[PDB]
Design a protein around this ligand. Structure first.
Ligand SMILES: OC[C@H]1ONC[C@@H](O)[C@@H]1O
Length: 443
């Protein structure tokens, strides 16, 4: 199964998950700093204080990417390293950190994909309401503009937001991610502001980087119905419209939220939200889709949104996520069918397994090889049926801080021994390196 000429094989990380040294060199606090330093928020009190120490070990890590012959690296920039107070003052040492990474990658022929926002909002902006405040569209545009002015001569591939559904709903409704709120009205104003801020950033990108491309990344699940009942099929319709790309792409491409999202959430959205839609339709260059698992879904009259998940005894990862490789083909087809974006990337796909270093000094993660191979094959399929998939990114290069799970979930194709900071390329890493070299699968 060979991929198109020029297909980008990548690996992906995020600033707070790997860097450590959150307050180094004049950096401002982030909301993940204050959230993880609040007892009870993160499994066994884990924080991003040290993480993978990538803040110091960045050169070695890139050298690993090079040695694996991986062609593209998706990483994110810590907003508070660049603007410690969120707006105003620019921190040169913050710029220098990412300049060195950028220059290094280009020297080695690796393509940088920069995620502008992967969840580490400056604490100083959270004090002014964060994603709840309409003014964040201005704050975000200013931050984006600084990035473009400083890095846009070298970085040509940009992503505004990582998984804005998670940012809004997990952060502001479920309260399990920073800033840790549980208010459905705040959560939907966050959804809306994330859109407005994304669109402002695209608009300034067009004034600042006349040769680049910019897009946005969404999380997606593969939802199937529990039965053939009408109501279960509809529960699936709502879950795709709410949890997957349509919550955002329907505004971007059609100028309104999806119909089942409005049925559920119109009372929570700002009163004149439609006034912002023509601006939200700012043209984007690509869609990034993240994908991990599938979910059986059932109408449920008692559930908060009239939907419950139902367990299936399929193979699961350490996260307890059902392994459903056909979901990545489905989401790929669906996105072309619904919005026909000109380019698509799988910006994250991967798995967490309970990896051990064997006596042989190796990490035999056949379970992860099997997971990757299966999904890469289904992505291959989608390409054969005309989906303009331009790239595929494994989450993650490294084992890292898995948010509220802390270090207990390992997604890397490279093992990190946190006691020593030693990297050990896993079997899956060697395997993936062979698929990049061959531009696809042997089977
Ligand atoms: O849960 C796995 C990944 O999902 N997408 C966002 C990442 O930061 C996260 O680690």
């Amino acid at each position: 199964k060979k991929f198109p000429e020029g297909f980008l094989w990548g690996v992906a990380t995020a600033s707070y998950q790997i860097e450590g040294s959150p307050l180094a060199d004049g950096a401002g606090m982030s909301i993940w700093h204050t959230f993880s330093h609040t007892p009870g928020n993160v499994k066994n009190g884990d924080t991003g204080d040290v993480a993978c120490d990538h803040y110091n070990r960045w050169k070695e890590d890139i050298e690993i990417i090079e040695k694996l012959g991986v062609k593209a690296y998706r990483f994110s920039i810590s907003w508070p390293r660049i603007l410690p107070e969120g707006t105003g003052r620019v921190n040169q040492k913050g710029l220098d950190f990412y300049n060195r990474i950028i220059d290094t990658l280009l020297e080695k022929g690796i393509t940088p994909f920069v995620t502008i926002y992967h969840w580490d909002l400056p604490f100083a902006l959270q004090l002014k309401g964060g994603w709840a405040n309409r003014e964040i569209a201005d704050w975000f545009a200013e931050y984006s503009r600084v990035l473009f002015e400083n890095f846009g001569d070298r970085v040509k591939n940009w992503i505004t937001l990582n998984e804005p559904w998670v940012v809004a709903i997990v952060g502001h409704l479920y309260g399990v991610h920073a800033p840790g709120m549980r208010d459905i009205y705040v959560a939907f104003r966050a959804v809306h502001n994330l859109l407005r801020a994304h669109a402002r950033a695209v608009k300034v990108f067009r004034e600042t980087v006349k040769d680049g491309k910019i897009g946005i990344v969404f999380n997606n699940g593969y939802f199937e119905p529990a039965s053939e009942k009408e109501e279960d099929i509809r529960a699936v319709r709502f879950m795709h419209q709410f949890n997957n790309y349509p919550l955002f792409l329907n505004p971007i491409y059609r100028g309104d939220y999806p119909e089942l999202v409005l049925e559920f959430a119109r009372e929570y959205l700002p009163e004149n939200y439609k006034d912002d839609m023509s601006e939200i339709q700012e043209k984007i260059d690509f869609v990034g889709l993240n994908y991990y698992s599938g979910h059986l879904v059932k109408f449920d009259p008692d559930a908060p949104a009239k939907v419950s998940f139902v367990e299936r005894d399929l193979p699961k990862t350490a996260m307890g996520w059902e392994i459903v490789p056909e979901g990545i083909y489905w989401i790929l087809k669906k996105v072309k069918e619904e919005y026909n974006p000109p380019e698509v990337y799988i910006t994250e796909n991967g798995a967490a397994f309970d990896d051990v270093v064997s006596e042989d000094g190796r990490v035999h993660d056949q379970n992860r090889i099997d997971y990757l191979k299966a999904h890469i094959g289904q992505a291959w399929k989608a390409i054969q049926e005309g989906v303009p998939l331009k790239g595929y990114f494994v989450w993650s290069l490294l084992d890292n801080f898995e948010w509220a799970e802390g270090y207990s979930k390992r997604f890397g194709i490279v093992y990190v021994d946190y006691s020593t900071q030693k990297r050990i390329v896993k079997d899956s890493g060697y395997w993936y390196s062979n698929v990049v070299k061959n531009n696809g699968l042997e089977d």
